Design a binder for this molecule. Structure first.
Ligand SMILES: *Cc1c(COP(=O)(O)O)cnc(C)c1O
Ligand SMILES: *Cc1c(COP(=O)(O)O)cnc(C)c1O
Ligand SMILES: *Cc1c(COP(=O)(O)O)cnc(C)c1O
Lengths: 372, 372
């Protein structure tokens, strides 16, 4: 009840793209398992669609940010392993236990708590223990703390020691040796434990792309690369091609000539610099399109190159074109028309805005469609 | 299946705020009716809650951007009039006609196509005719086109001539007199009609706040002001107080000391200036908190004023504080703690981001809760 199927504005998600992206990243790292990280409604691309595409692409498990996102997948019909990579109130451990959802914990006392929640229910909880190696967001910060926590899960019959893992801060980036640092930090914080977990995993998109040999990549936690976006800072060249999954289109709802000097948009600050035609489409910055995307190209279906002008409004954008355009004509905001294309990267460049932030702004109000 | 009820991160929506806001706006303008404009999941604030707060506050009708939003309102159990202020595919006119939803049209052939959709169904559709007086988004551009359209709905017994309206581009603003321009333009395009609509309306928050006397304000199409946000450019003083409706809180999930020179966040670019404590909360930019919100104050429940450091990640944020803080402690990102307050405006100032854009960024992943 968020999407608007009767509004001719859509996000297109290419199946063939996602398939290629996982293949090429998996190839680069000779991974055995690909974990599709579809947190935040699949990086705002649309979870039901991306989850499906991910499995089609060959992912075999999921990573989500929180329990409720994990619940949603189960409710979607998926039976594959699901890791919650954020932290969870132990009071709600029972839900994860009942739906085979693996939960991360960063504290011995929270582990204890989650186990006591399950005491006597006949339920069992898979547990993961993130180790903080330098990101400093979550995880154990000392071998001693880690070893104690492992001790606790071994003494709790309702818990399974599913995994240990850590996350990189600069695998995205020319900063090797913060990568190497986190890796020696792992060795420090993690060397011979009193017992092993079922699995360990380390790699995000960055690791898999630019540092495949630094560390074990049998299990890859693949988020952004899936969506065909190069998020590196600065933009680093890759050992392969990503093809972006999402394109953004809508059909003209209002069409009119406007005369030189006519003001457009809130503030009345854009004035047409000559006679032409103004084209109104039904997506705005409430759909996720950059609040300051005005001045962006926009590829009309007839092969014209228009430009967003006036404000980008909440629900509507206005486009200036030289030649008449009929209502119903689709306009591509992101994607390809002929030999012209507009990318998320063009968008980032134009708005002086992070591509990671832009790829993540799309609201559920836009109707999603899977293609090729 | 979007909201995260088990995650301790919420949007709180102040009943007393919305009530005061509408009251104060209604009073300044002496409106007879107030139309809550709740497009875009109610400016990203949360539709089911804002609709309910809107009615409690004294709104007696709704305005939305599109048919599907109107549909959702109906499916929330609301029976009050609903005006769709965007344009709609005539093929879907029946859905509106079945649910007592008023629909805008900017064209004679669309009015005719919609009437023909209804012929023989026994249904009746309420139609509004937006007149473009200088915003140049949608609406009729000539008296000739307007009258030909008024005649068409008159000739069609499946249609009711519900309203004519127009929207201002600069009521937000000190550019009076583009205001006056639009008003003379109204006169120009609109003088002696062959038949009058049931109603006409003109005013948005801007008109109602800064230009109440310029034109009839019996019906006010109240958007931004309802949420207690002053969106004027440049920030203009008002003849009343707005009190912002939304605050943003979340409970600490991970808490640790960190030592001088420790790096935090993606890029490892923040270094702790001294020995301190790092507080991790479960909200990130995927929830709508500004992507470059790092450096913001964050008001911990114990009275401490912390700061967001490292990245604002997708789902999490890290906060540096001088003194240790227990897991489960709430942090206020937007709102008030003791004699300290952080507002949406503080956020716009700090991020150099439009406050209209920021107020519209919140994802449905955040749990909504109504307070006072
Ligand atoms: C978001 C996330 C991922 C995915 O990382 P990408 O850089 O998008 O490939 C993997 N592991 C954890 C713990 C995460 O939070
Ligand atoms: C958004 C909108 C409103 C509300 O405008 P505010 O400035 O937020 O009060 C009123 N009328 C129309 C046609 C709109 O699109
Ligand atoms: C000590 C100190 C630091 C340390 O940060 P580094 O980047 O590790 O040098 C930073 N800022 C201030 C004000 C300090 O006193």
């Amino acid at each position: 009840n968020y999407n608007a199927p009767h509004r001719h504005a859509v996000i297109e998600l290419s199946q063939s793209a996602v398939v290629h992206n996982l293949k090429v990243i998996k190839e680069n790292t000779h991974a055995k398992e690909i974990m599709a990280v579809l947190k935040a409604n699949a990086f705002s691309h649309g979870l039901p669609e991306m989850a499906s595409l991910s499995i089609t692409a060959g992912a075999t498990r999921f990573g989500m940010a929180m329990l409720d996102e994990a619940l949603t997948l189960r409710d979607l019909g998926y039976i594959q392993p699901i890791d919650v990579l954020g932290l969870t109130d132990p009071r709600y451990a029972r839900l994860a236990a009942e739906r085979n959802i693996t939960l991360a914990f960063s504290t011995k006392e929270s582990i204890k708590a989650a186990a006591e929640q399950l005491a006597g229910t006949g339920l069992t909880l898979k547990v993961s223990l993130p180790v903080d190696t330098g990101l400093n967001r979550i995880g154990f910060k000392s071998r001693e703390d880690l070893v104690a926590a492992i001790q606790e899960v071994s003494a709790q019959d309702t818990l399974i020691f599913q995994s240990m893992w850590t996350h990189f801060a600069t695998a995205d980036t020319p900063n090797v040796d913060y990568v190497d640092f986190q890796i020696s930090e792992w060795q420090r914080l993690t060397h011979d434990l009193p017992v092993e977990p079922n699995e360990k995993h380390f790699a995000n998109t960055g690791i898999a792309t630019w540092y495949p040999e630094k560390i074990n990549t049998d299990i890859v936690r693949l988020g952004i690369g899936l969506f065909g976006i190069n998020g590196s800072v600065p933009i680093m060249s890759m050992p392969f091609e990503l093809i972006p999954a999402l394109s953004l289109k809508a059909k003209v709802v209002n069409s009119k000539p406007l005369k030189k000097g006519d003001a457009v948009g809130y503030g009345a600050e854009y004035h047409a610099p000559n006679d032409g035609y103004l084209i109104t489409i039904p997506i705005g910055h409430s759909d996720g399109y950059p609040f300051n995307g005005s001045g962006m190209r926009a590829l009309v279906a007839d092969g014209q190159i228009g430009h967003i002008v006036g404000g980008v409004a909440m629900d509507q954008s206005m486009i200036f074109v030289t030649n008449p355009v009929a209502v119903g004509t689709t306009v591509t905001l992101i994607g390809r028309v002929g030999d012209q294309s507009i990318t998320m990267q063009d968008l980032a460049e134009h708005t002086q805005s992070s591509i990671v932030a832009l790829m993540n702004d799309f609201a559920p109000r836009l109707q999603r469609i899977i293609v090729s």
